[PDB]
Amino acid sequence: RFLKVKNWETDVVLTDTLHLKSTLETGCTEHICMGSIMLPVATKDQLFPLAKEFLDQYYSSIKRFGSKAHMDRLEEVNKEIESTSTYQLKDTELIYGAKHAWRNASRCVGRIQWSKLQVFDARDCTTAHGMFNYICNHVKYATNKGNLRSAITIFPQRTDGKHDFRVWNSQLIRYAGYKQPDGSTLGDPANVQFTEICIQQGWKAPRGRFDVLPLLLQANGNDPELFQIPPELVLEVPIRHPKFDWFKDLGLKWYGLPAVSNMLLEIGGLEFSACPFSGWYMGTEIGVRDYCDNSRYNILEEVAKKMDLDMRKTSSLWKDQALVEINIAVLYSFQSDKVTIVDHHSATESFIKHMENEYRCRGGCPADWVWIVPPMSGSITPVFHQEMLNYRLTPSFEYQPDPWNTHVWKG
Amino acid sequence: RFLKVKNWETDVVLTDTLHLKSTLETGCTEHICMGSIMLPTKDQLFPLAKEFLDQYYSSIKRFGSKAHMDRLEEVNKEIESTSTYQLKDTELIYGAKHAWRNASRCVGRIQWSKLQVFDARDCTTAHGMFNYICNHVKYATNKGNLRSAITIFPQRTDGKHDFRVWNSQLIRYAGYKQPDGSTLGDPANVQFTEICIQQGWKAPRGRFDVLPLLLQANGNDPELFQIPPELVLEVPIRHPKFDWFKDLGLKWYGLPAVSNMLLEIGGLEFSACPFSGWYMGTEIGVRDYCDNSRYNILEEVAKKMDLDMRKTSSLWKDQALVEINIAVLYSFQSDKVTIVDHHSATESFIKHMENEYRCRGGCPADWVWIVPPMSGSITPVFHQEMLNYRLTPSFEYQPDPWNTHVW
Numbered sequence: 159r160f161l162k163v164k165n166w167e168t169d170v171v172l173t174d175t176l177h178l179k180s181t182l183e184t185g186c187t188e189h190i191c192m193g194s195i196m197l198p199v200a201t202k203d204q205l206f207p208l209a210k211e212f213l214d215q216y217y218s219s220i221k222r223f224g225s226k227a228h229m230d231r232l233e234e235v236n237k238e239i240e241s242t243s244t245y246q247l248k249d250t251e252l253i254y255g256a257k258h259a260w261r262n263a264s265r266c267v268g269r270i271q272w273s274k275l276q277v278f279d280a281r282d283c284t285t286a287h288g289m290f291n292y293i294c295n296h297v298k299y300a301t302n303k304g305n306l307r308s309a310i311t312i313f314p315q316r317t318d319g320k321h322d323f324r325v326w327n328s329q330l331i332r333y334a335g336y337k338q339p340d341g342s343t344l345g346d347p348a349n350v351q352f353t354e355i356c357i358q359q360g361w362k363a364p365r366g367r368f369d370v371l372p373l374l375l376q377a378n379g380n381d382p383e384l385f386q387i388p389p390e391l392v393l394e395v396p397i398r399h400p401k402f403d404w405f406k407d408l409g410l411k412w413y414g415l416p417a418v419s420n421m422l423l424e425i426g427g428l429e430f431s432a433c434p435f436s437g438w439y440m441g442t443e444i445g446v447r448d449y450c451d452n453s454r455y456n457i458l459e460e461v462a463k464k465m466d467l468d469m470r471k472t473s474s475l476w477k478d479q480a481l482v483e484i485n486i487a488v489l490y491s492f493q494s495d496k497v498t499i500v501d502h503h504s505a506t507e508s509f510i511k512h513m514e515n516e517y518r519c520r521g522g523c524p525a526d527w528v529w530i531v532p533p534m535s536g537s538i539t540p541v542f543h544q545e546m547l548n549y550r551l552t553p554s555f556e557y558q559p560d561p562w563n564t565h566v567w568k569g
Numbered sequence: 570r571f572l573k574v575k576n577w578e579t580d581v582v583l584t585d586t587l588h589l590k591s592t593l594e595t596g597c598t599e600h601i602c603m604g605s606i607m608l609p610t611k612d613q614l615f616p617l618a619k620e621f622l623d624q625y626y627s628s629i630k631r632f633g634s635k636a637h638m639d640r641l642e643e644v645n646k647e648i649e650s651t652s653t654y655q656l657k658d659t660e661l662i663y664g665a666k667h668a669w670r671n672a673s674r675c676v677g678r679i680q681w682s683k684l685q686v687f688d689a690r691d692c693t694t695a696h697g698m699f700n701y702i703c704n705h706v707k708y709a710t711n712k713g714n715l716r717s718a719i720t721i722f723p724q725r726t727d728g729k730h731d732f733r734v735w736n737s738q739l740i741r742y743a744g745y746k747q748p749d750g751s752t753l754g755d756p757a758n759v760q761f762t763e764i765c766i767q768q769g770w771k772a773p774r775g776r777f778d779v780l781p782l783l784l785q786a787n788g789n790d791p792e793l794f795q796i797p798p799e800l801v802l803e804v805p806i807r808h809p810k811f812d813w814f815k816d817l818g819l820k821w822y823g824l825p826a827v828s829n830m831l832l833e834i835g836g837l838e839f840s841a842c843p844f845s846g847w848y849m850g851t852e853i854g855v856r857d858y859c860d861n862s863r864y865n866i867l868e869e870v871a872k873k874m875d876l877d878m879r880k881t882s883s884l885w886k887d888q889a890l891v892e893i894n895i896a897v898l899y900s901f902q903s904d905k906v907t908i909v910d911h912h913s914a915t916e917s918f919i920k921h922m923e924n925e926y927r928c929r930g931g932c933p934a935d936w937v938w939i940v941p942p943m944s945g946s947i948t949p950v951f952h953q954e955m956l957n958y959r960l961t962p963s964f965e966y967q968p969d970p971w972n973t974h975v976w
């Protein structure tokens with residue numbers, strides 16, 4: 159099975175064989191496409207084959223497939239599984255695994271960068287305090303005074319499922335949201351429920367529009383504990399506009415480091431339930447989604463007012479007009495303060511080069527068009543015109559349920 | 570079995586059961602999603618007819634009635650003898666409206682039940698086809714108060730007697746390759762334009778030359794025809810703020826009319842079925858004008874706007890895109906030619922989905938196509954999960970006739 163994809167703008171045709179290595183399921187069937195659905199304890203029996211596939215992959219990557227070193231590793235892992243019901247990854251295998259999970263992440267437009275990932279091994283961590291320290295170091299290293307570097311920190315793997323390490327925050331750095339009695343929200347509405355848990359856990363909320371949330375960290379299946387990230391470690395960028403001097407008075411700012419902390423990293427059947435990773439922002443993530451989603455900060459109207467746009471009819475495209483201005487402002491503000499950011503034109507152009515390279519050297523590149531195409535100006539980016547194939551490879555990042563939903567409170 | 574779709578902006582959850590009546594295949598498997606791929610006998614005919622008649626008779630609340638059973642026998646008989654059958658007018662109108670209703674890539678379906686169906690099954694020649702098409706064009710255009718319409722020519726027989734419109738749309742602009750190396754007019758229609766010239770068309774060789782119609786009746790070689798200019802409503806493009814905009818020389822036609830698809834009703838294949846509605850503004854302002862491989866006017870517009878074109882991060886492309894799209898909507902509106910903006914079309918489609926979920930148990934929808942090519946996430950459809958599946962009657966793609974036709 160060889161599958162072709164075409165770019166309808168350049169006529170470039172690519173051939174995918176990599177999808178043949180794909181094990182897991184998509185959610186689609188021969189009779190239904192679920193391509194726009196957001197979300198469509200392992201035994202000894204299942205664990206050794208997962209480890210074997212992984213180690214075969216790894217040993218092939220280093221060009222030592224079938225070597226004594228390969229065979230001895232397989233037998234040692236097999237022996238460890240029979241003896242302990244699980245196994246430990248070598249450092250080299252862990253690094254390879256984390257890099258490949260990113261490389262395999264079909265929703266990620268930033269994958270050109272996949273092989274430059276700083277991996278921090280935190281598998282010796284035992285406590286929430288220890289977690290807090292590892293996370294501070296990650297943020298400092300990743301931030302690098304505005305010259306952002308990709309990084310991931312990997313806490314100990316799942317054992318019986320009763321001893322999970324979890325970061326309860328969905329991102330390492332995010333702003334509080336507060337629901338007022340009149341039904342309005344102060345700060346980020348996406349984080350209301352989590353903000354409430356923090357407060358209940360004893361967090362003293364400043365109750366402003368951009369309060370950096372505390373970290374809520376769970377080690378070894380224990381109840382999570384609160385920690386405040388040192389503010390000097392949180393790089394933030396005040397948002398202003400190069401031509402509109404009133405833009406600064408909206409009082410907007412955002413943080414520089416996007417750091418996902420709620421996903422599960424699977425490598426060779428092992429499950430790393432706390433594996434916060436970070437890169438740098440594409441401008442639209444902030445300027446389109448965080449600022450302009452109706453369910454988020456929702457600033458379109460206010461910006462449109464200040465621009466004196468005709469707001470009587472949608473057909474004036476006043477929303478579209480303000481949207482662009484806001485995104486100009488985000489990019490200009492990050493650049494002026496020398497904080498790494500990428501615009502959607504540049505990021506998508508790089509992704510196309512990446513994808514073409516991946517087909518040539520790897521036999522394919524799994525990609526989720528729904529997610530890769532930016533949330534503004536879709537068709538003026540080269541990805542809009544690129545056919546893509548979505549399929550699931552491991553190592554992988556996976557979603558997991560929010561821990562407040564599953565956690566057994568001890569007290 | 571039962572499937573949920575959620576809207577992440579409103580938290581409204583809908584349940585889909587209509588997918589369980591899906592016959593055709595998606596291109597996807599359990600192992601691979603092809604959601605972004607653009608193009609993924611006697612015995613055969615009877616279950617198809619029955620499947621169709623059963624849904625028809627259930628639609629008019631006569632499922633299992635004598636009229637139902639009697640029609641199933643009458644069709645079984647005609648199939649057993651002729652190897653095809655003929656739709657009643659009522660069935661043909663129902664099948665057409667439902668093919669639109671079932672078009673998962675169409676954002677404009679709130680309108681599906683107000684389709685005017687022109688039965689051209691009595692047509693025998695290209696001149697006859699030309700007459701039907703002029704009438705369709707004039708009826709649909711309605712002096713700028715556009716009305717949806719489809720004209721349906723005779724159904725396929727042996728497949729050597731096909732009626733085809735060779736144009737992809739009834740109305741489109743010519744594309745010519747130049748000594749310069751660049752392209753004059755619409756580059757999407759370069760190959761079709763050459764075939765017209767090859768067939769004998771005298772090209773005016775301008776930027777916006779309405780293509781002639783190239784019509785094929787009963788499997789014969791196709792013939793050229795100029796649509797009467799007075800029947801082609803065009804809109805000059807100007808900007809409500811920018812005086813200089815008019816001087817780019819831009820115009821577009823008011824009537825969007827797909828003529829290359831195949832309409833399938835109860836196993837019967839209608840290879841010539843031009844249909845038309847009215848434009849969503851972005852189809853012209855984003856795609857026709859700004860695609861790199863289309864009129865590609867972004868560089869010129871950004872220049873007139875004196876934007877900073879040195880870095881992509883000034884979002885000069887995005888600023889100019891918006892102004893172009895404002896101009897398109899302003900112009901059509903000023904000329905009272907029906908047009909819808911992407912905000913209003915997508916809001917209506919969300920209302921339509923909800924209607925369809927409560928009334929029919931679902932609405933097949935292709936998110937990749939429904940979400941507009943600009944400002945995606947500020948439209949409600951962006952945040953709406955959709956399930957895509959294939960119901961019949963339907964519109965389907967077919968080979969371009971020139972790659973097929975035996976001369």
Ligand code: HEM
Nearest residue numbers: 260263265266267268271308309435436437438439440555
């Ligand atoms: C380095 C610059 C990076 C850029 C510009 C980038 C960009 C993006 C964007 C725009 C998305 C779509 C998510 C959304 O819009 O909500 C995304 C998703 C994702 N990215 Fe990347 N990313 C980068 C680094 C990374 C790194 C370092 C990793 C892991 C090592 C990663 C893994 C993922 C994953 C797993 C998703 C899916 C998130 C989800 O499904 O919710 N990304 N990325």
Ligand code: HEM
Nearest residue numbers: 669672674675676677680717718844845846847848849964
């Ligand atoms: C009344 C106003 C209408 C609006 C605003 C509208 C809107 C649209 C849009 C935006 C598309 C995507 C096309 C593209 O980007 O190239 C589309 C596709 C489509 N439409 Fe509608 N439409 C309308 C009427 C109709 C009618 C009357 C029919 C049939 C009777 C129809 C059938 C289809 C089909 C079959 C497609 C997919 C065709 C393809 O894949 O190119 N539409 N429509």
Ligand SMILES: Cc1cc(N)nc(C[C@@H]2CNC[C@H]2NCCNCCc2cccc(F)c2)c1
Nearest residue numbers: 196197416417418435436437438439440443557
């Ligand atoms: C590392 C990195 C760099 C970067 N520039 N950008 C990112 C995107 C983050 C990660 N993940 C989405 C973005 N964060 C937004 C939060 N949304 C969660 C996605 C979601 C919601 C609901 C259901 C579901 F299935 C998925 C990461």
Ligand SMILES: Cc1cc(N)nc(C[C@@H]2CNC[C@H]2NCCNCCc2cccc(F)c2)c1
Nearest residue numbers: 607608825826827844845846847848849852966
């Ligand atoms: C009836 C109607 C009304 C309306 N507003 N809008 C429409 C969409 C038209 C028809 N169909 C596309 C749109 N016209 C744009 C031309 N593009 C051709 C699409 C295409 C190109 C290459 C390969 C392929 F598979 C498909 C129809």
Ligand SMILES: C[C@H](O)[C@H](O)[C@H]1CNc2nc(N)[nH]c(=O)c2N1
Nearest residue numbers: 194195196528529951952953954
């Ligand atoms: C319903 C739909 O699948 C959902 O809104 C998706 C669409 N595409 C996306 N793309 C990105 N990058 N991020 C998102 O959150 C979403 N949301």
Ligand SMILES: C[C@H](O)[C@H](O)[C@H]1CNc2nc(N)[nH]c(=O)c2N1
Nearest residue numbers: 542543544545605606607937938
């Ligand atoms: C490759 C990709 O499927 C292709 O560019 C599609 C994407 N979505 C689209 N959506 C619409 N409405 N029209 C199109 O032509 C396309 N093109």
Ligand SMILES: [Zn+2]
Nearest residue numbers: 186191597602
């Ligand atoms: Zn699919």
